[PDB]
Amino acid sequence: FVNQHLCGSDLVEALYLVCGXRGFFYTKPT
Amino acid sequence: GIVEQCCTSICSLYQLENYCN
Q: Which residues of B touch A3 (CB under 8 A)?
A: 10
d(CA B2, nearest CA chain A) in Å: 7
Residue A13 amino acid letter = E
Determine which of A5, A9, A12, A17 to mutate to test the interface with B (most B C-beta atoms within 10 Å).
A5
- Cβ atoms of A11 and A27 within 8 Å: the answer is yes
The four Cα atoms A11, B4, B19, B11 give a dihedral, to 10 degrees, of 80
Q: Does A3 touch chain B (CB under 8 A)?
A: yes
Report how far residue A6's alpha carbon sits from residue B2's, in angstroms, rounded to the nearest whole number.
9
Method of elucidation? NMR
- Cβ atoms of B10 and A3 within 8 Å: the answer is yes
